[PDB]
Amino acid sequence: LFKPPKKILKSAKDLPPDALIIEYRGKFMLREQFEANGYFFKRPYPFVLFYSKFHGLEMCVDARTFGNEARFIRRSCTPNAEVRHEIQDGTIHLYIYSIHSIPKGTEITIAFDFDYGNAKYKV
């Protein structure tokens, strides 16, 4: 369970590891759609989540449109949560899960999803 007091998403309760926290809702686009709409893929637009872990198929969720409190989640190199996917009725949904236990009143963060650090390589 979560809570947002910019606004910051925070654990409402001492969550256990691997706990479903919140769905990242918004408009789903493949990379090509995002680029056709005029935006650059994996550059840090506010309220946009980039996700590449569904079998290498690059997509994003634009939460300027009917998003929820999940759009407020900040990125961190030391995150306590992660984006996971599931298929429901042939539609992909993205959810934020805890990576380990999260004390109540701790900010919920996920790993950087956009091109940060200006690196030559990545792991």
Author numbering: 24 to 28, 37 to 154
From the manuscript:
The SET domain alone (residues 323 to 458) crystallized in the space group P3121, and diffracted up to 2.1 Å resolution. To allow crystallization, we mutated an exposed and non-conserved cysteine (Cys 453) into alanine since this residue caused heterogeneity of the protein due to dimerization by formation of an intermolecular disulfide bridge. The final crystal structure of the SET domain of MLL5 in its free form was refined at 2.1 Å resolution with an R-factor equal to 20.9% and R-free equal to 24.2% with good stereochemistry. The overall tertiary structure of the MLL5 SET domain is similar to that of previously determined SET domain structures. A unique structural feature of the SET domain of MLL5 is a very short helix α1 (two turns, from Arg 365 to Asn 371) where other SET domains usually display a four-turn α-helix (e.g. DIM-5 and MLL3). Accordingly, the shortening of this helix results in the formation of a long loop (from Gly 372 to Phe 381) that is very uncommon in SET domains. This large loop between α1 and β5 occupies a groove which, in other SET domains, serves as a substrate docking site. However, contrary to MLL5, the elongated loops of these methyltransferases sit outside of the domain. It is noteworthy that this MLL5-specific loop conformation is observed in both molecules of the asymmetric unit and does not rely on crystallographic constraints. Indeed, the β1-β2 loop is disordered in the crystal structure, suggesting a high flexibility of this region.
Even if a hallmark of SET domain-containing proteins is the histone methyltransferase (HMT) activity, it remains controversial whether the human and mouse MLL5 SET domains possess a catalytic HMT activity. To better understand the molecular mechanism of human MLL5 function, we solved the crystal structure of its SET domain at 2.1 Å resolution. Accordingly, biochemical and biophysical experiments showed that the SET domain of MLL5 is devoid of any binding activity towards histone peptides or the cofactor S-Adenosyl Methionine (SAM) in vitro and does not exhibit HMT activity on full-length histones.
